[PDB]
Amino acid sequence: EFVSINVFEVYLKLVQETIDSLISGMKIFYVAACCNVMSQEIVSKILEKNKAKLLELPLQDLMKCTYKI
Amino acid sequence: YQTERFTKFSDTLKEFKIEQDPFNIIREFRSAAGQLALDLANSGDESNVISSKDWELEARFWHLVELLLVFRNADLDLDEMELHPYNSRGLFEKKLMQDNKQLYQIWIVMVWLKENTYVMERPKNVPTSKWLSITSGGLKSCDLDFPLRENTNVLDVKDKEEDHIFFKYIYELILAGAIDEALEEAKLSDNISICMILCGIQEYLNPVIDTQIANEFNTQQGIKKHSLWRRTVYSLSQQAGLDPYERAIYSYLSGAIPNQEVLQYSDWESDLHIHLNQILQTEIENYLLENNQVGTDELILPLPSHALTVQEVLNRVASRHPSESEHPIRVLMASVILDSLPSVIHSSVEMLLDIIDKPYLLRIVTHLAICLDIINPGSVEEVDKSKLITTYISLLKLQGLYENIPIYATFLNESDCL
Amino acid sequence: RSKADVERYIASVQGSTPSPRQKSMKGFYFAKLYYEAKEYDLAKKYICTYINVQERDPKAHRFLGLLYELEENTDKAVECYRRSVELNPTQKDLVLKIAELLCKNDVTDGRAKYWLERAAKLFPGSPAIYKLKEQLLDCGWNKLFDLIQSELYVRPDDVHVNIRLVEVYRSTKRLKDAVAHCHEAERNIALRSSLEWNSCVVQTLKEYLESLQCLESDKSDWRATNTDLLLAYANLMLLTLSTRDVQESRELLQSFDSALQSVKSLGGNDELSATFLEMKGHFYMHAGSLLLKMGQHSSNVQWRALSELAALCYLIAFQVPRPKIKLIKGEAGQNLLEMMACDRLSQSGHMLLNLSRGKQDFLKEIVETFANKSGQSALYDALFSSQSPKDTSFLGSDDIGNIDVREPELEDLTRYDVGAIRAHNGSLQHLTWLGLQWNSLPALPGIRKWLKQLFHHLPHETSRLETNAPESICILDLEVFLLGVVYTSHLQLKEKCNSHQPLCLPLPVCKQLCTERQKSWWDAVCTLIHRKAVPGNVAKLRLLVQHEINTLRAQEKHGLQPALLVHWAECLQKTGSGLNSFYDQREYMGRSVHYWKKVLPLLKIIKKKNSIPEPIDPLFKHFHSVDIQASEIVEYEEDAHITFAILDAVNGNIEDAVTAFESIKSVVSYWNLALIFHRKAEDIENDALSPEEQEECKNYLRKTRDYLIKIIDDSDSNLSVVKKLPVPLESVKEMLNSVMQE
Amino acid sequence: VHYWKKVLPLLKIIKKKNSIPEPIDPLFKHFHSVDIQASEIVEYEEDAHITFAILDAVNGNIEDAVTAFESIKSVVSYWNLALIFHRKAEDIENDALSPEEQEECKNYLRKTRDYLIKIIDDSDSNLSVVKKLPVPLESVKEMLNSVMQE
């Protein structure tokens, strides 16, 4: 065919990272589906992790964040 | 005579290749087109008014090109600004415009946009004094906000009609960058309070604190609680029972998009200008928030925080003005703005393989390509230069101006074949 | 520094900024010194913490990627570069790196392909781009061949790629195809100039000679391939002498001499025999150049003896006759062979002269003393180690018979140079050398003819002179350019030896004589004109040229010393004043007046002993060695006023031109006064017209006669005036003969 | 000239399309109806330069006044050029004095005649010029009658 945020997210999923994150957050702000997407991103980040850069990336969901900290 | 044209452009190239800075070429191209714009315009067949506008447009294009390539290319990198938190917002704004070239470019473009904006002639027979409603009796207060406090029925018809003349004129002046003239008009036409409103445009500086501008200023100036000012103005802009041009003004000042009644008459340039203004305003205020130079008290109201990209503004304004958008030199205008310029050169090159139908185009692209490779050796693909000059030369032949073909030859060994 | 210096600074800023955020924001500047103290497990954690607070810095992210590169952790290093690249797109070199690393580690994923595509569009057809294309393929023989061929289609001048084609041919042991392409490629002017290519050419040929396939196939084309080896040797020798060191150059000579000895036995009357002839000359010429290289570093006694020896070598070369061009199969081949001949005579020629100017008839002694066969053994001795067999060495067996011992004539030398401009692909090195070699001679080189031989149909002056766009480049611009390059080069070398002959250096031995800036420009405008640029690099090349145009035309902020402008002005006046046609006269005189008009304001300030505003990063280095003095100002003002008058005359303002010419009693003003008085007479001299007018017409022809006689009278008396003549003396006399017979 | 000298700094800022610092409770109300535009700036600079020259002439700097007047081909500059050329002639016209000087004196009266004629020629042709006359048309003709009878 070639919204942009979603495309960035999809590209990340198939796979700069910070920009994609900001895009996804903005999309979430723009409700249930957005929360689901946010949770998916969190799970993906957790999988990638498995120091300062990591902290920068980080900056029920609340409980998870607390457990992480 | 006018079928001289090519000479002028050719002439400029002669002078350049011969004093062996290249930005002068383009400057001359501009002036050349402008001169021609005048010719076809003055006394002419009404078949000429069209190609006259295509020359004025030509000229604006060369100007935009000069401005942007001068800034981009004559970039020799100066000294970084070191601010402190005690520094005024004014300095932070300046820093922003220094450090972020992407955004300064937006400024450059807006400046160009203003440069070429039409403004009506100064209203004649303007009255001695404001709302002179007073004479009918019934203004219990002589302040701009009185008929807002209670029904607009207070103001005489003629007074409203004049306020309309004023606010429209001020608005045109603002879109043209004529801020000084707007303040002069406000002062002199007994619109002191509106004048005062126009003074809020400046961010705060204090030469004493903001040392690094103790040259430009001898006295503090500008207004400290600007985020407030800005919401105050924007809210004022949304309050109806004001003249549509007044609301339009406040819209522009708040970094917003003016009401429909006014915006409906804005063209590609005007509209694009409006939206770059929006990008700009939003970006500054965000820059200030990221540096804690905004105070929470001032966030009275929600203004949008998400800046568009110049790409997207262009796409939207385009879809809002398709006819104008599609005009072939204004496509180049956009191409220059986005830097996708050799991109479009190679493109219109392949359109020679409904570019032949319009005469200016094949010329312009060629001379632009020449300028580009002069200023930035490598810029346009060797082949594309060959193809372009080839075709334009064959038109120099069709015009019977073989005389000045060698000048254009000075860019290939392919020239051998002439 | 040490471990203590860096770990003690921990307590330095720890005591200045103790909060965690500022403690971590100093991590990059902490890590800055551990990378220097060879601590990579430590530096890694320091930068990684600064990245924990400053996660958007492209510099820090790249620095960690460069540190993970030293750790050889590809997956970690790549990711770091990615972050710096996505933050800042202007980091082109990182897009290459990512593409470079993705193809080296694993190609299975298309991500490596993607990043290679971007790397290509950021560096159009760079040498690394193909390297990565071959790497990605590596992870079958027919497959590689198709890449090279498809790559050679659009990049036939790439040295590395063509080399790979020979290597692929050689890997399949189809050497006949290897030499076949090697032969068809020796016609390429660019490849012929490539040191590494010629080295490959020498090997692939020798391999074929010894190859079983060469004998079985036939003995008919054996001679054809053999010719290319000698040609390759000559080119390879020219290049090795310049770049490589003393040892390597000498070694190449032995291979050359072995080939010559192995070839002479066959003889005959075909291309191979003709090639042997010309290559024979090259051998001595290069051998002479090789000799002079050793002596330069050595003592004085060896220098004279070696230069004596070299003088003989160059002499031998110059004597060798022009090769039989008609005798070659094709037009390309024969033109090439002649081109090299001109190069031989030109290079050896100037050397022969510069060595003979040292003393009176120095050449005669060289022949009378070393033409003896004793010299042949003294030459073999100095060049080679005597241990090698002196029988199969061509040097020891050549019949040195009747050395002409005649110094070269300038007129012959000029046509040798002009014909050899394309010898070394017109490298500004080549021309700046020639221009300098003529800097010591009384006759000047036909630069305008050199440029016509290089950039054909490039107009003398471009109509669109108003702009500096490089589509308006003109042979004048180039002519004006080379003049400065040589005027600049001479002064730079003059300064060098003063701190420590400059003419005596041969072309290969000497180093770059121009500034890399100047060389970059010439290479750019050359690639642009000849249409061997790159679509991607077109815009860059184009701008690189554009940058300097405003200086070659003395426009805004020209980096031109007043002396160089004056030199340009007069050098163009006298260049133009000797031309026959009006078009060329007008142009060269116009430019000359232009530069004059730019200098006179400077001279006036200099006339009152003030200071000139020095330049900012000038294109042509300033020098106080040639700074204009008041002693010479009035002369330039006068010489300029002539140039003004000349242009006035060419335009039609005869009244003002004569009024000016007559004001100054100069030899040149006579030739102008005479030339314009003759024209007013000749046209009106024979048509039916008023008798009174006819008498006035004859009266002008009488003035012409008188001025030409004043020229010859003053010319024969004094030599300094002979050099001031705007045209040759014999040309002045030639007109006079016709003037009086009229 | 005084008021002119105060405006020109403002006009120069206005000439580059900048903003004028508006006043504080002005005595004469400002109006954007008559705010100066760039279209009229060069005219005022010219019309002012005339006013400068006129005062220079009245003070005695005739050389600079004429040099300025002649620079601009305006109807008013003619009446000034003429009026000052006539005075240099009339005083020197009849006293005993060097004959060569007398010829130079007459030469000025010849210039006076020419400039007055240029006024009337351009005046009768166009009405806009009639309004630019610094004095009445009949007054210009009145002088000319006396100028030529001299």
Could you please report the per-residue DSSP string of chain D?
-HHHHHHHHHHHHHHTT------SS-SS---GGG---HHHHHHHHHHHHHHHHHHHHHHT-HHHHHHHHHHS--HHHHHHHHHHHHHHHHHHSSSS--HHHHHHHHHHHHHHHHHHHHHHHHHHH-HHHHHH-SS-HHHHHHHHHHHHH-
Chain B residues close to D12, C-beta within 8 Å: none
C111 neighbourhood in chain A, CB within 8 Å: 15
Q: How far apart are CA A42 and CA A59, in angstroms?
A: 11
- What residue of C is the nearest CA neighbor of A15? C111
Using CA atoms, how far residue C286 sits from C186, C313, C343, C344, in Å, is: 20, 8, 12, 9
The CA–CA distances, whole Å, from C321 to B58, B75, C235, C351 equal 63, 57, 20, 18
The backbone torsions φ and ψ at residue B209, rounded to the nearest 5 degrees and listed phi first, read -95, -50
Method: cryo-EM
On chain D, the residues whose CB falls within 8 A of the CB of B170 are 32
Give the gap in angstroms from C-alpha D74 to the nearest C-alpha of chain B.
25
D32 and B122 in contact by Cβ < 8 A? Answer: yes
* Residue count of chain D: 150
Interface of A with C in 14-43 (CB under 8 A): 15-19
DSSP string, B76-130: ---PPP---TTS-HHHHHHHHHHH-HHHHHHHHHHHHHHHT---PPPPSS--SST
CA distance C679 to C683: 6
Length of chain C: 742
How far apart are the C-alpha atoms of D42 and D40, rounded to whole Å? 6
How many angstroms away from the CA of B260 is the closest CA of chain D? Answer: 27
SS (H, E, C) A8-64: HHHHHHHCCHHHHHHHHHHHHHCCHHHHHHHHHHHHHHHHHHCCHHHHHCCCCHHHH
Q: Do chains C and A touch (3 or more CB pairs under 8 A)?
A: yes
Backbone angles phi and psi of C465, in degrees to 5: -75, -10
Spatial contact of C84 and C76, defined as CB atoms under 8 Å apart: no
- Chain B residues within 8 A of D31 when measuring between CB atoms: 126, 185, 188-190
A9: tokens are: 């997210």
Minimal C-alpha gap between B21 and chain D (Å): 24
Distance from CA of D65 to the nearest CA of B (A): 35
CB-facing half-sphere around the CA of B175: CA atoms within 13 A: 28
Do B148 and B201 meet the contact criterion of CB atoms below 8 Å apart?
Answer: no
- Which tokens sit at B241? 């029972």
Rounded to whole angstroms, what are the CA distances from C702 to B139, B152, C263, C730?
103, 102, 68, 20
Nearest to D32 among B169, B177, B179 (CB): B169
C53 and A CB contact within 8 Å: yes
Say yes or no for a CB contact (<8 Å) between B187 and D34. no
Distance CA C354, CA C176 (A): 46
Cα B364 to chain center, whole Å?
21
Structure tokens at B47: 């078949």
Mutate to test the interface with D, among B117, B181, B193, B221 (most CBs of D within 10 A): B181
Query: Closest to B17 (Cβ–Cβ): which among C473, C533, C551?
Result: C473
Interface contacts (B, C; CB < 8 Å): 280
In the numeric block, which tokens belong to residue C167?
């290597």
Q: Does B114 touch chain D (CB under 8 A)?
A: no
**Whether A56 and C83 lie within 8 Å, measured CB to CB:** no
C 422-481 residues with CB below 8 A of B?
455-474, 476-477, 480-481
Length, in residues, of chain A: 69
C551 in B contact zone (CB under 8 Å): yes
Identify which of C30, C28, C32, C35 has the alpha carbon closest to the alpha carbon of residue C7: C30
In the numeric block, which tokens belong to residue C82? 């990615």
C465 is written with which tokens?
A: 């002179």
Gap between the Cα atoms of C546 and C535, Å rounded: 17
Nearest C-alpha neighbor of C47 from the set C58, C68, C63: C63
Determine contact: C653 vs chain A, CB below 8 A. Answer: no
D83, D116 in Cβ contact below 8 A?
no
Q: Are B348 and B366 in contact (CB under 8 A)?
A: no
Angle at B412 between CA B406 and CA B413, to 5 degrees: 100
- Reduced to 3 states (helix: H, G, I; strand: E, B; else coil), residue B205 is strand
Are residues D35 and B190, on separate chains, in Cβ contact within 8 Å? no
Q: Most A CBs within 10 Å: which of C22, C42, C55, C98, as the mutation test of the A interface?
A: C55
Query: Residue C215: exposed, middle, or buried by beta-carbon count in 10 A (0-12, 13-18, 19+)?
Result: exposed
Helix, strand, coil share of chain C (percent; to 5): 75, 0, 25
Q: B69: closest CA among B356, B388, B373?
A: B373
Joined together, the tokens standing for residue C398 give 């050549």
Eight-class DSSP state of C508: T
Could D33 and B187 be called an inter-chain contact, meaning their C-beta atoms sit closer than 8 Å? no
SS (H, E, C) B375-406: HCEECCCHHHHHHHHHHHHHHHHHCCCHHHHH
Asked if C559 and C619 touch (Cβ cutoff 8 Å), the reply is yes
Q: Compute the distance between CA of residue C621 and CA of residue C515 in angstroms, rounded to an integer.
A: 9
Query: Using CB atoms, which residue from D18, D30, D33 is nearest to B187?
Result: D30
For residues C581 and B98, what is the distance between their CA atoms, to the nearest angstrom?
56
B230: burial class by Cβ within 10 Å (0-12, 13-18, 19+)?
buried
Spatial neighbors of C157 by CB under 8 A, at least 6 apart, are: C188, C190, C191, C532
| Angle value at C-alpha C14, between C10 and C17, nearest 5 degrees | 140
Taking the C-alpha atoms of residue C670 and residue C721, their distance in angstroms, rounded to an integer, is 12
Closest CA to C625 of C440, C436, C441, C494: C494
The residues, ordered by sequence, that sit 6+ positions from B166 with a Cβ below 8 Å of its Cβ are: B123, B126, B185, B189, B191, D32
d(CA C558, CA B359): 37
For chain B, say whether D16 makes contact (Cβ under 8 Å). Answer: no
Contact yes or no for C677/C703 (Cβ under 8 A): yes
- Are residues C318 and C345 in contact, defined by beta-carbon separation less than 8 angstroms? yes
According to DSSP H, which parts of C562-629 are helical? Answer: 562-577, 582-607
Which of C51, C85, C86 has its CB closest to that of A53? C51
- Min Cα separation B103/chain D (Å): 24
B-chain residues near D18 (CB < 8 A): 180
Q: Are C83 and C47 in contact (CB under 8 A)?
A: no
> Per the CB < 8 Å rule, is C52 touching A55?
yes
CA-based nearest residue to C484, from C554, C549, C565, C544: C565
Q: To probe the interface with B, which of D7, D18, D28, D31 has the most B CB atoms within 10 Å?
A: D31
Helix C516-529 vs helix C538-552: angle between axes, to the nearest 10 degrees?
120
How close does chain C come to A38, measured CA to CA in Å?
20
Nearest by CB to B382, from C457, C533, C556: name it: C533
Asked if residue C169 lies in contact with residue C177, where contact means CB atoms within 8 angstroms, the answer is yes
Residue D35 to residue B166, Cβ atoms within 8 A:
no
Report yes or no on chains D and C touching (3+ CB pairs under 8 A): no
What is the distance in angstroms between the CA of the first residue and the CA of the last residue of chain D? 34
Across the interface, whether the CB atoms of A18 and C53 are under 8 A apart is answered: no
Residue with tokens 């020449």: B370
Residue of C nearest to B25 (CA): C467
| Chain B residues with CB-CB distance to C545 below 8 A | 373-374, 377
Q: How far apart are CA C682 and CA C78, in angstroms?
A: 83
Q: How far apart are CA C89 and CA C92, in angstroms?
A: 7
Residue type, B175: L
Cα dihedral sign for D72, D73, D76, D79?
positive
Dihedral (CA of C77, C82, C84, C85) sign: positive
Give how far the C-alpha of residue C529 lies from the chain's centroid of Cα atoms, to the nearest Å: 16
A21/chain C closest Cα distance in angstroms:
13
- Flag if D29 and B190 touch (Cβ within 8 Å): yes
**Closest-CA residue of chain A to C83:** A16
Q: In angstroms, rounded to a whole number, what is the distance separating the alpha carbons of residues C724 and C738?
A: 23
Closest CA to C276 of C253, C259, C251, C252: C259
Cβ pair C539:B376 closer than 8 A:
yes
Q: H-type helices in C500-535, by residue range?
A: 516-529
Please give the Cα distance from B358 to B354 (Å, whole number).
7
Measured in residues, chain B has a length of 418
